[model samples]
Target: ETAPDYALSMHGDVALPADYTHFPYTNPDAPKKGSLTVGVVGTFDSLNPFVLKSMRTTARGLYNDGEFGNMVYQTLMLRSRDEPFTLYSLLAEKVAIDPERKWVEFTLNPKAKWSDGQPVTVDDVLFTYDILTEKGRPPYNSRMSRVAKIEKTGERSVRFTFNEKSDREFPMLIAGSMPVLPKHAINRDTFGNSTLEPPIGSGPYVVASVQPGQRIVYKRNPDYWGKDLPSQRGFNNFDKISIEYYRNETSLFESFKKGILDIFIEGNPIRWEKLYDFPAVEQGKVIKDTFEKGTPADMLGFVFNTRRPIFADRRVRQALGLLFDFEWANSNLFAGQYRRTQSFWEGSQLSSVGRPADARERELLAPFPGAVREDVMNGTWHPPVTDGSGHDRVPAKKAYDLLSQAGFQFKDGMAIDPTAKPFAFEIMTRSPDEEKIALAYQRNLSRLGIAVEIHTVDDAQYQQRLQTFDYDMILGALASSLSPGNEQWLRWGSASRDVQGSFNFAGVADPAVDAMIEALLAARNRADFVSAVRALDRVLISGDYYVPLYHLPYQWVARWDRIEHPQKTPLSGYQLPAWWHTS
Candidate 1:
């Protein structure tokens, strides 16, 4: 029941030094009078980024970036993108996770206050917990549901008690994700309704103005309560931040060329290598940075909705994956700057590749035989490769053999499966880049008599279709992090398959996946956790639920020379808030 220290780790004690003034990743004396304007492609209809609404323009500057909602709102504990499974106090100045892990408590800094001058109280914290659990959206509700009870023990202290079945890491997940709202300004009954009313917040910046579907502006809070706090010393450097919207990628690039955008994060690798030929780049007015990042690049790939009847067969899924020509794509389309992500836990020690599975993994996986490929279990599995010839015959023949075994046979240049239907599926795309990749895949699948159609949709419609599982395949990313936790459950759990807005786009509901998720969550020590994660990675790969795609080894970025950032970037990589203008 007692509040403990400043930080804690899931497996061991966090290395928090005394007299720690600020994170090493930032400049404590950074100048703070510049403005930053970045670009986001697509329209935004709502300012309430927390609701079930789609495409409500989100960014860490104005609100949250649709990742974790920790921008305009503050979390109890802030995660160090520099380390896995560790957290330090943010809104809460101190914390204590009991030895048995049954109860987690936080003592909020009394100085913390809403933009309107009201103190952030236990009442507001409890209000957030209640509403998010009752009427909140997907991951929020699911993540918060693990805690059985929450109450205020003191004026600034809040305690969350978990059920016996809750994972040891559950406390951190909820703490890190929960954003305490200004309950004083918001009505519980109207929280879910979409609006641009600018609900009050407790972050370093506030929504100055918003033009729906066009732009959002955030002004620095002059009296930001945490501006001088040790944890936030080197951050919130910009005086104002604005995010402008473009309808498509083509127009977005044109805007940057005309000097409308302050910075641009390049997602298209081919364009990154080729398009910087513009004058602003050659003359060095706009800077290009290929800075190396420490963590995994977002895993981009083709996601198979198992809910689709055409993708129900595991063999059919595996066969389709073989048709993707990575070697050819890398050389011709991607400038060879990318590498295919081999594991769900890619770019980390826990990745189930290039190493042998230990005894702990074997015991946990013993009950689920054939859950991991023999080579994969022995740590020697790699995706199908081509001869870099673009017209490799081995992969095509191998795919044909697989489709044939899955009750599909080639006849008259068309594949006929057991249902007596010609093998056909649609690849849904939301952007020109996705359609470009889909067209190339169509050529390869055509060899096996699999007719493929590329369906393009607007971002709003694309999101709606995904919610209902209404496509054969979608070119999307099942983005993974270094410290995977309850979110994995939503992506692979049986219960999440039918949830309309859930991220389990694959619709995987296997008992083996369920058991493995439990194993990963129940892990209590470092050795046990790593083994469990690798085992989880193995089963996901075995399912062939996604045609795993490539990641750029180094992020290709371009920013106007007018703005600058610290030489030291955090492990999670480039942060827009860390950059300041040349003034």
Candidate 2:
């Protein structure tokens, strides 16, 4: 067999050569100066991000997608945002693997050291595996389930052999994103509980202070080992990162306008257009920027919990979905800055929205003949269009006909089911934006005589209810990646239906969904991968599991003029770590 490669790629070839100096989207000579204070709307009580207890409420600046800076723990390899699915060395210096991907090995960098000054060894990797497998949360804890054996090969090298249930994508997932926790610092006996004790990590920054739910600060480690590494040359430029918490977005935006916070990402288009007239903008002290992305729009909408008997039928689900009137909502509520989302992957080539099925896609979907609607398969499907009047009767009439076939009867101006019960359900919301959307939905459903109630709850209770699947309907968002992999199983697979804390919020359990995920994982080339993803998109769109909502055409960001970023944006859009203070 050939020697191991310097980098790993899911499909196609790695963009940068082996001897490349730094990433193309970063400035290698950037000065590591200044401190950045970011304002977050929610609260956090736990400093640990690995355990199931308070998993979603963990503190920021620990581990994230470059939002606050993953200041604490480090991964084995660093992903290049410019490329779709490629990983370069970070903690692990190099890697070795077979073409079949049955086994893989990693050689740790000898200079990699924890913030407490202990060397990162092969033993730490093995210890993290056993500890996380026993006590970690959903995505982190399930990483080692398919491994047959793990053993130390060399003084600094470790190898993982796969079982029969493993896929070709499993090995790369392990090497690219596994968090290497320090075994010497973490106590295995109490690793599962949530705590505010500042933990040791192997990344660029150390936890400097913790104000418990109000603020957390990170100070850059002057002895950082990977500061000069090729994959990390121009990133993590901030000497200090402070994450401040607020009760809601209104307060956070107020802080930004006062120049107390450095950055603000506006998701509401109405606010993006109406707000930003503060004194900071009038004096040219702030910048409002828009970025174009190459990835798919996240499928954000009201997700139906099919576990409930009321939503067990597809026809009933479709009838409720048609009453959501995106045209009126976008024009009135959002200042016409959003587009109706038709597919899960709405704005990408991998999407099945406006493209006819090719031969490969048709062959993969042949087993499930009626799984995709004819309009969706032919690329002619679009969401119901209204006349911009909040009360449009065409969709209500269509919805009424669909409900009639589902054994629902209208009696005394109320929707009555075949079981002699009225159709009534609740839409659980966690924020003002979601409540606004739910209120409009309730108004639309009232025309059909279907009783819809909106219930707004606190964050803690909302997360608990979601984990237990206690609601009838809730606004949920599932993000999409250019390279769709094992994560699809967590979102739409049958096995995830019963798993608590999984992203399968819709309670989907179909063999066709599971098979499509398998097909995508086994794909060895770009052509086959796109086909499998499009097939999966078709199956999801035809399922009517969500009342599809809207997405912005571009990313919206506002920042103070003291901060500066690179001229080029990566495929992942504007990266926070790549932006630094100009002063």
Candidate 3:
């Protein structure tokens, strides 16, 4: 499954390191016993995370197995509300940002090795970038497209020169998402596109067995690398990990209550508020906790297909946006657990005050004449508000007025567009419960004389539709990073819109937005970069490309009391590999 170009690219000046040792953690004092089976609701399309777009399960699984398979995989950097970010050199001994901040250099720990006993090297790092850019189609290609080049300066040193200057968040992209692969194991294959069984990696764990739809198992690497590294200390505590798959959330939760799964990360708000009060919570067998550290402030809104003729009209799209009774939904459906999001980069330095073009934004908007407008750019955007009892009429009335003015009239308790044909479009969703949310929106639209068809598919089908830009609208949520730097290119860049496997599913092509993204990416310092991104965000949200929804302030997790974790970190919800059994 490797791509041809990836194979050709590998036949170059790079050479694999000789002193690599795979699986260096066979002798750790942490008790390497007992298998931890995790119950997951969704099914994965491919074991390859890069190939598939909506592969949440596959991505998390590979990260757990590939990096921390031995016991735990520690993040290179960790952030918290109370503490400044702590940086650790897990695989790399030191990381340095260039004077202009356009280039980042990393020196690999000489002791770092793959599970197969190969030393981590500059060739592996360089090859990973090449595959991600040249051959790994769609999403993977989009992730690394920002890099200008990856240079191998020394046996243990690698330099990543960005196309533009970036802020501190640049290191997170290198340390977090991109994992180093074994060049020796993948040399013969095409690399990026290859769906090779048991991919060789330099993580703490190794593949034990994969049972397709049933289960995938990983065992600790006996000679796991990075065990004694300063960054990886007190990490990778799990002995063995087994991830069990299920078709729906109901079964997954049932398995969790039955002790078939050790941990549960709840997403369904109704379930989170109602379901957890069972015997598990009462007997103290499982503890449910919420932490506010890593969660971003953003809404889960419908992404309208602006490319479609029917939805292309700003009035119609705005009208459709008005139909959502967010206040009611939050109270009745979500139990008021979420906050409405105004900007894509909410809860960060990028969130702006007042909608539309300010003086500073006007200069940014000068490049595109008709693209930015007062109503479109600086309008007052509002999220739904709910009273304690439940229903709210304010959002409903506002939705009604907006739709009415946009050529829709109420008839038979539904709104219809006169002269433009009946309002009809499909809202595609993946989860069954999300389909129910779509249906709820459908009922709300009925009050506006609009009819919505619900198309619910599995993860693979949903991803295919998104890839082809095949649907009229999509009801989904995007997981954005706390650092707005990486997200800037992902959402609004011209290159990002067409990049395979990226979240720019909206296909935004505004020139001003694109320039802003580039400016932010290339900024030389923190202040310049943050200001650029903040300006860019205002431009995007004002366009109303995405109708902001709600934000989850905390990562809600339910696990047996036996599992223990350190005080919450501002970066991740729960560090799974760091968790250990108290019983």
Candidate 4:
């Protein structure tokens, strides 16, 4: 068996024919000149984007495009949202893979050169896989650990032979996911350590200047070697890009209102509705709109930190989930603009909602009897519903019943342990909005005779606490992707449950979830993939790790008119870096 020049989606075939020059989502003749400035809320101590420590206020100092943001550095392959999963060669001129996906070979683009004017060789690729697996974060280490061996085949070529049972997505992930570190510039001994000093990258832009935690500047390389690459026609067009940092949402929105920032991603419903009456919008210099998204709605919720002793019981977690009245919260706070986010993969083809579990799913879930709730498995389950009235008693009764079954009862109007200790905990937050949401949630818990306190902390404190899994409960979002693969390992894998900085914030360590993840990743066809994921969702829904929250299918966005995007919005929506300055 021989590999194709490009890797296509697992479900279907590739969208753009190999003969195509540029993607349908981009403007091939886009003019590039002016600089664009944006804002983020945080402080940064690290320039490295690879390590888990970088999750704490890390900026995309020299990013290669793959979700975090559009970038200065390029990858071995470029992913197209035009399809579910398609990778066209970038740093690699050609690639070969067998039908079973046992091995993948990449022939490097010999002309590719780092900003320091050194040719990118097989050494750089080898170094990236080596250091990333050695010191990088969860999924990186998990993915690279699957590879049996990586060998340099030719002068400018590399081959990765995988363990026979390795996932089908491993080849595609290894090909496009990692941001290659430069062997010429990065010190091997200190490559994994955090530093503000930018490491070498081979792409369109370079870190021109930095002001520590305040702002970062990227100057476009006029002599970028891949300027004319087919896949990069309309990307990285700006001559300069600046990211300004704000410590709070108030300061961030104030900057946007004053026209100091180019864009405002409206996460606050109240602000999006009442605040765009500024001179820029009145003078036709700014615009606001709710953009429809083709991807899944973000799964934001009040997450239960199950690592805490108080939340160790599944019954207690489910009872806590029952107290949040989404109806009252949505109507009162969101202006009826949001809907309950029931599935982790809400509003997408991957959603298990409204579909009965098939025989294949039942088979994979057979080992863990009763792990999948009958309601969830039969597709009849929804987040506990309550009347919009703030004083509804049905959900409260149900919550009381569940907790009572878990060995707790009310004593003198306070929920108490069997040993006479009061049930109490604090919900931590990093923002006023989160505090407000927690306050509303606290009111409902109070009705259940549970003592609840809301605690607000600074960004540094919140991140540190979350990293150590030290909170009782926290408001969080678990974003979804079109092709959910090895990333599941980082979020729900038993291994990551013990890792200090892993994404399993709820402390999930279920054998059922791990088996379903393996099943999903090893799925050979679309039918198998769908069944495996639906089964996984059923298991998670039954566990009730979070109080399922609400989501909007559209993004409330406000931006300046000086920037211009193409007529088309890809499946994943706007490509921020692909949009260039029009003025």
Stretches of candidate 4 exceeding 4 Å from the true structure:
8-13, 42-61, 64-70, 100-102, 114-119, 123-152, 162-169, 180-200, 208-215, 303-320, 366-369, 393-434, 448-479, 483-511
Off by over 4 Å in 3: 1-35, 41-88, 95-106, 113-201, 206-225, 246-248, 295-299, 307-316, 347-349, 353-380, 384-435, 448-473, 483-512
Q: Name the lDDT value of residue 362 in candidate 4.
A: 92
Model 2 spans with C-alpha error above 4 angstroms: 1-4, 11-13, 42-48, 51-58, 64-66, 115-118, 130-145, 182-200, 303-320, 393-435, 446-474, 483-491, 494-510
Off by over 4 Å in 1: 1-4, 10-15, 42-63, 66-71, 116-118, 123-150, 163-170, 183-200, 209-214, 302-320, 335-337, 396-435, 446-476, 494-509
Q: Which clashing pairs does model 1 show?
A: none
Instruction: State, as a TM-score between 0 and 1, how close model 1 is to the true structure.
Output: 0.82
- Score every model by TM-score: 0.82, 0.84, 0.70, 0.81
> Candidate 2 residues 297-352, lDDT tens each?
98898999999999988889988898998888888788899988888887877899
lDDT of 4 by residue, 1-583 (tens): 3335855456545777677778888888887998888888778767777777766656754554233254655678888876667788788888888687788889988788888889988999998888878888766667666788999999999998999668677777777777667777878778667788865688787888878789988898887878887887888878988888889988999998888888877777767767778888998899885566567887888888888778988998888888898899988988887889999888877788878999999999999996888889999988877898876899888888888898997987999865568999999988988988898898988887788989999999889998889899998888787678877999999999889999998999999999999999878777788789888888998899878798876776677888888888878777776788885
* Candidate number of the best lDDT: 2
lDDT of 1 by residue, 328-373 (tens): 8888888997898888877876788877789988898899887877
Model 3: per-residue lDDT, tens digit, 1-583?
Answer: 2211110111111111223231122222444456677876666544555544344545245653422332322332222222212233566666665544477677777887777787777887777767666655454466455567778888788887777544445544665556565567764354434242676767776767776667877777868876664335455667677888898888988989999888888766778888887987998889997765533555477888777776766666665665566666777778888766766666654565354445655666677776654544664545454453323456567767776776676767556665546667888888887786687778777655667899888898888888777888887566654444556566667777777666776667778788777776665444555566666766676565777777766778888877766664434345565566554
For candidate 3, give the lDDT.
Answer: 0.62
TM-score of 3: 0.70
Ranking by TM-score: 2, 1, 4, 3
